[PDB]
Design an enzyme around this catalytic site. Structure first.
Site, PDB file in Angstrom:
ATOM      1  N   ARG A 150       0.862  -1.198   0.090  1.00 28.21           N
ATOM      2  CA  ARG A 150      -0.236  -0.085  -0.021  1.00 28.21           C
ATOM      3  C   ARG A 150       0.811   1.331   0.089  1.00 28.21           C
TER       4      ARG A 150
ATOM      5  N   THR B  27     -13.924 -13.886 -10.395  1.00 24.98           N
ATOM      6  CA  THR B  27     -14.338 -12.568 -10.464  1.00 24.98           C
ATOM      7  C   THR B  27     -15.106 -12.430 -11.544  1.00 24.98           C
ATOM      8  OG1 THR B  27     -12.563 -12.167  -9.003  1.00 24.98           O
ATOM      9  CG2 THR B  27     -13.458 -10.196  -9.883  1.00 24.98           C
TER      10      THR B  27
ATOM     11  N   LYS C  45      -4.907 -19.184  -3.977  1.00 25.34           N
ATOM     12  CA  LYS C  45      -5.340 -18.127  -4.911  1.00 25.34           C
ATOM     13  C   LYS C  45      -4.447 -17.752  -5.823  1.00 25.34           C
ATOM     14  CE  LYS C  45      -8.220 -14.639  -3.376  1.00 25.34           C
ATOM     15  NZ  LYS C  45      -8.102 -13.477  -2.681  1.00 25.34           N
TER      16      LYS C  45
HETATM   17 MG   LIG Z   1      -5.079  -9.997  -3.298  1.00 26.61          MG
END
Ligand SMILES: [Mg+2]
Ligand SMILES: O=P(O)(O)OC[C@H]1O[C@](O)(COP(=O)(O)O)[C@@H](O)[C@@H]1O
Ligand SMILES: O=P(O)(O)OC[C@H]1O[C@](O)(COP(=O)(O)O)[C@@H](O)[C@@H]1O
Ligand SMILES: [Mg+2]
Ligand SMILES: [Mg+2]
Ligand SMILES: [Mg+2]
Lengths: 498, 498, 498, 498
Positions: free
Chosen positions: C90, C296, C238
């Site tokens: 971030r 998604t 994932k």
């Molecule tokens: Mg992620």
């Protein structure tokens, strides 16, 4: 599926119009006559074979002249074959004319020429000097076409070998000896073979059946022995042992074709393994795109009998099923009582087996085993055969001077016959060993240059019409080169005959 | 791809441990001895055959007793086969001995019994009364195993037929007459056949080789002739003419197995078409899951010779390649000079051909041709064979009392042998005609009820271990039923042997 | 052939009775209610997903308790999933609340925490300390889910990097940053992730959706973080980048299953390559026999709209066609206006695509890619599915305690549903991620030991009857172990229900 | 095997040089500008589409002129497409503005024009007179693109129908009415359609997108409406209902191409069944060898968003995987915010999917489904594509004046692009709907007669070289005819480019 194909094979359905497989006949006393030869040619003979293991140059001269006379009389092109005597390992002379052996006896095989003229039932001479050194104890020795089996026990002298007899047999003067498993360092071409090849090359033999080929180098020795005068003559190597089948890949690359000489092979290798060797050799020769001849006892009983055995019929049929271009008679036509009848039977089994074959499978099996990218010459030849199956063409026409293009079209095993329009008469007689190929000669000196393919093309379509394969309105696949770059085909065209 | 398989066949690789194909031998003078039979059984004989075309009942019980003695001595189960004489069409007596015929002569074939004892070289008698009516002009008549050919020209009498002699042959008294390409309305079972079958059912013959089967109704006539005493005996129909091949589908459904009797078939139908008939019949019998035998002269030369022809070896190999459950010797073992040697050669060709076969392809070819939904019995048996290929199982074990389950497993042609644990001794000998199966008997009265299939299961695994197929740690497929169901297999289990 | 299958697909034919594919719903404000959850479960929800990227341990506690209440109310087993926040990169805090960027500007990305609280439109802070060293000039940097693209120009300081802005966008405080192509050395499990996993493991979550998996070692780190209390919980990795798809083989071996997280993957890798990644990952997971989730925007427009786009329908259909066991909703069920309707649409597309699939091809494609010899457990499971296609079985029954056997049966993609009779309730909820598997619980403490498989077997057949798949007389394939060696199945049996 | 192909797909491997699939864009306010069109053409547009459902003739000639200007400026051939308004069933006017409906209400649908101008929330007018007769109780009626669902309860008048409101929706004046699962007897061509087609044939439109095609007779009505002036213009039938899919076989035979108009089809038929219809229609159009377009909302989100959804990318990819010659943008390019960007994304997904396709499988699937014997024109074209795969040809060159030969070559889906050298400019734009083809024009009046096809041949090889597909030494397949035949290709030649 073979199972799905078989369930549905009709014993009452009509056979094919044309004959794709070819028949090779051994000329002998029963068939040397110009009338006897005109009889073999009329029955099915595409190639005349001369066994040089016996017979004088005057005898074979008569065979050459008589086949050429019979061929010219019937207006056909027949290939002349020369089956070389090949490197031989023979025994010495036996004491007072013969010597007999019993199961258990201790015999001596000597390489000292002192035992050459004086060979008793206890000790005898053998041609091979490497013999005691190459043959090691435990190993087998076969005398007189494998009739008498000998087991190696111990090396007595640097020339002699102590052996155990395990087969009751009587040996005659200078009988043949075969060594199973072992690698024999004999010459590729013997002193007689070189003089025989010289006579053959000078007399215009179309092909050479090279006896006892073990290595690819041995094939090159034979082509060297042929010289500049025999540059264009085909070399069909005869696989007669373990070293033949072991180096089959290399022997295929070096040779123009192959013969599964089951005769001497069956004496060298165990009888049951000759089927596996046959299947292997035949299929490798198909992927390679080189002719395959099947050779011994095809219809043996018909040398004396007027009908073949149930076994002899399945043998001729399954040789064609395997992928063999040719099937061979030797003794059935050479010294046989029914020379015309045996060829007539062979032709009927060939057309039957040819009809019971799934035509698409052999093409797709060969094509899929091909390395991609293909050469433009090969992709045009395979696609010409692909087009033939697609349009349901009644015949394929090829303009091949060498025969190299016609052989690569036959390589993709089409359903229809292949008509080869050639400018060389040797090519006409050399395509008698390749399947589905039926040659037509175009005399360049007697008709024209024909730089623009049209006379040869019109010649071929006319021949196919006369022979009865193509009728008016039928579609034909035509293979040649574009007016731009010649020497290899690039052109393929689908035309209606009319 | 068969081409890709063939190009990768090693003549030097080791053969399979077990022998899957089965061998049938005709018992004759050369092999009637208990020592000669113990010799055939030791060499490869799985089924002993009795040709009832000749020989007295006193002579046939001599072989029944001798085979049973030799089997019990060696501790093996050998099937006893009765090849019936069948409906025969024979000629009359040739006055003054024999009659001779020349190509071109006009002969007379009469159905009036006046010419029965007095048959000259111009006119003779034939057994078939319906002969001049059924046989129409242009048609062919074959005398003495097709050796002499005669063509019908015109109907002279309502009993006689004017014929043209096609070849030179000398006819003896009461020689055989075959009629090609026409439906012969002869009985399914002759008067002698019925008495032969009665003796057969009485002496406990395992299987009947029904000579000259034309229709499916004819096989039901044979089953009726067997009665309640011969309810469980196998009916192997012999296809001998063009009708047998025409109604093959119906003859398969009605029979317990089939024999490609190439002998009489080759006399009826053209020689080249016997290969197409063989392939068709053999593959249809595989989809059906019923045994199929090959017969006439497979290793013929070995009757006199100590080695077979190249042709005879490919014939034995290709019969196994086609899908034949069995291969047969008639005369080679009956009157042959080398009775043990010929069977020994046959066994070696069988194991060779068995090794050169694509294990999975035969299973997948048969499975894909089967109708879905499958019966639970069949889906278990096919999946048991599928599991065997997947886990690479060294052997399959089946508990089959009738033999119907073991035949259904052999139907899917596995790579490994099938061990059948049965409670019936007839089943042990009846499965000598089915491929891969090797039976083991469980004496219910001498060991126990074994309601929970476990004593038979432990018996089988022990047999497979001793015979050398399965070693410690190997995986085995086991087929039987659970307690909630019987009469048909339900369960399949993969077990590691301890 | 897909072309031959497609030509003949009926838009009017009836769909399958059972639903083989599974649906996974992300629980959010729109679906946290016990009534909203009972609504999702009734519509099609097999697994409830919790996104730990946001939400307190009190919020997810409510999600855990509410799904368990809704499940118990409806008497169903629903899997509880924990989608970890994962290692994040971030940005820092922006000067006076935000900073905007224009195409052409020269921005500075600093790793010195001096620019953490004070981040201007010319220079800002990034979480990753490796950043200037790992990211080399020419390379790309994606800020705020790839909305703003940055090109690396030169390294200003040992902490700063000079960048070119080529996308007009306004960046907020601590927005996310993704590095395409580059190998990020972030931890497998962050400090929050370890505390989240602790809460999950202690609360009894059935499976873990491990965010941002790059290596197989990273998978082992997650299983280690789960400890002895979370030994049996599934790890579904994932794949969110290049390192995911590059090490997919190793990540498959290490994980219990895989999720094609197209969301973050589409931001990392180019949009068009996410189809290739999907197909590759899904098919590799089929050969492996491990669950595959597609994730998604499956039906994105249905977050606001009452009907999906033409694209969204083909996406759900083709995920099932590819071989995906599961399909996933996140935001469509979490914050969506039509939460029940979107799941109802997904179920209809799944049953449609399931019907338009060639059932035999997926089994034969998976089986033929399997290494032979197969383990006895696998050869019994594949042959059980083979039997199911052969007998046309209406259902397969498996007695699996772990779920390992049911997963290997589902691996061979049968036409019918798989009923799993298990003694563990966790297994009931873990088979909600595997295709065609519908679990039934057998309470060992409340019924019996059932060492002899018969109560579990009778329980399963009863369940299949009630659910309407099997009627009286229908055939069922039953898989378990023989009374002898348990712990892996070896037993397969075909039984009629009645 | 698709599974084996998928498991070997690299996300890092380089994509194909050429783009085989074609893109169609709907021209609207966002893309009517000559600069906006030059932008679409530069991004990927091959065919420009004009939706005649709205817009004046003055406005449609503005786009005709602008597309022609932008095409001539860039030097490209772009096809002009006319998507007709088609027979429409619209409602009446809603008195006082709009009418609103709630789930449960009893509405009245009247065919009496008394309710045309005065339509209340209890009763309204519908264009279709045969509406109460054709629509029977239980049946559904869809208002405003299926948004509002109404079920017929009872027949009130011979003009009115009592209906139950299934959902909450507000209806506007003259909104559309679709009738699911029933044959609508509307005209093939409406009064406006005929005048639109007249303007279309007048302004020289290359192809007609025939809206709402129900039967094959309806496509003949459209061809009749085109006349002798529009004999050569392509008729692409739009499948919009259940009848279109029912009579797809006949509609294919009658039409020049097909469009899977998923928009109106998704409103008529259930959403999940539009995938099955797509797959069926696309594959049937491939076996037929006729162009097939995909249409409704493929990259829908990109109308407002700068990036597409995960779903939209798989939809574009799978349309190409299915076998679609074309992919379409309606509204994405017409009224979209990112008109160039959406086409750029579509082109990238097309090249990706094109690379992930099994080159040979599509050819062999199409070839094996074709009826044998093939026409000489087809066997040449299929074998030309077969040769291309064999020699690994970098490009195929075809001389096609109509385009029928180039369409027959594209039918066999080659790995390389097809270069079409044509003498007609209409053909250059009409082949913008067929896969792999890239046209080159030969001005006969400006260069020569070229009776010996050589100037066109040299023109094509030059184009392929410049475009970067073929380099020096590369092999090319060339398809045309010889001098003895014209109108259909006969010859095929493999040439090495210099
Ligand atoms: Mg992620
Ligand atoms: O039909 P076949 O081959 O005799 O065997 C079928 C049945 O025989 C059985 O052995 C039944 O008898 P058991 O009492 O020995 O189990 C089962 O395996 C099976 O159901
Ligand atoms: O039917 P199409 O595609 O226009 O082309 C077919 C014919 O066109 C041709 O070009 C004929 O016209 P040419 O005079 O240009 O050869 C041939 O190649 C072929 O026979
Ligand atoms: Mg020799
Ligand atoms: Mg007989
Ligand atoms: Mg419409």
């Amino acid at each position: 599926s073979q199972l799905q194909h078989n369930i549905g094979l009709s014993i009452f359905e009509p056979v094919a119009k044309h004959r794709a497989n070819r028949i090779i006949c051994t000329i002998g006393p029963s068939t040397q006559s110009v009338e006897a030869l005109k009889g073999l040619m009329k029955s099915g003979m595409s190639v005349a074979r001369m066994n040089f293991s016996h017979g004088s140059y005057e005898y074979h001269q008569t065979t050459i002249n008589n086949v050429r006379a019979a061929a010219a009389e019937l207006g056909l092109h027949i290939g002349i074959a020369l089956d070389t005597k090949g490197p031989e390992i023979r025994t010495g002379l036996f004491k007072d004319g013969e010597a007999t052996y019993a199961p258990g006896d201790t015999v001596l095989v000597t390489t000292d020429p002192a035992f050459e003229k004086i060979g008793t039932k206890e000790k005898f001479y053998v041609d091979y000097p490497q013999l005691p050194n190459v043959v090691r104890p435990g190993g087998l020795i076969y005398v007189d076409d494998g009739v008498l089996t000998l087991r190696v026990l111990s090396k007595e002298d640097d020339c002699t070998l102590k052996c155990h007899v395990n087969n009751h047999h009587r040996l005659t003067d200078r009988k043949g000896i075969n060594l199973p498993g072992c690698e024999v360092d004999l010459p590729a071409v013997s002193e007689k073979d070189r003089k025989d090849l010289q006579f053959g090359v000078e007399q215009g033999v179309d092909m050479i059946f090279a006896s006892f080929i073990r290595t690819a180098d041995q094939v090159r020795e034979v082509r060297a022995a042929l010289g500049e005068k025999g540059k264009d003559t085909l070399i069909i190597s005869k696989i007669e042992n373990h070293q033949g089948v072991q180096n089959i890949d290399a022997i295929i690359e070096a040779s123009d074709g192959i013969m599964v000489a089951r005769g001497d092979l069956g004496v060298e290798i165990p009888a049951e393994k000759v089927v596996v060797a046959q299947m292997c050799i035949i299929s490798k020769c198909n992927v390679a795109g080189k002719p395959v001849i099947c050779a011994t006892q095809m219809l043996e009983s018909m040398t004396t009998n007027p009908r073949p055995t149930r076994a002899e019929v399945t043998d001729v049929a399954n040789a064609v099923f395997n992928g063999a271009d040719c099937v061979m008679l030797s003794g059935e036509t050479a010294k046989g009582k029914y020379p015309n009848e045996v060829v007539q039977y062979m032709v009927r089994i060939c057309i039957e087996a040819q009809s019971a074959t799934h035509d698409s499978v052999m093409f797709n099996s060969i094509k899929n085993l091909q390395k991609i990218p293909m050469s433009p010459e090969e992709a045009v030849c395979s696609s010409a055969v692909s087009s033939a199956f697609e349009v349901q063409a009644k015949a394929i026409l090829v303009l091949s001077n060498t025969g190299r293009s016609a052989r690569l079209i036959s390589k993709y095993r089409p359903n229809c016959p292949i008509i080869c329009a050639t400018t060389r008469l040797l090519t006409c007689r050399q395509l008698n060993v390749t399947r589905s190929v039926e040659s037509v000669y175009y005399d360049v000196d007697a008709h024209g240059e024909d730089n623009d393919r049209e006379k040869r093309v019109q010649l071929g379509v006319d021949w196919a019409k006369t022979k009865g394969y193509v009728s008016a309105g039928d579609v034909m696949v035509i293979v040649h080169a574009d007016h731009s770059v010649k020497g290899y085909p690039n052109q393929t065209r689908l035309v209606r005959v009319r």
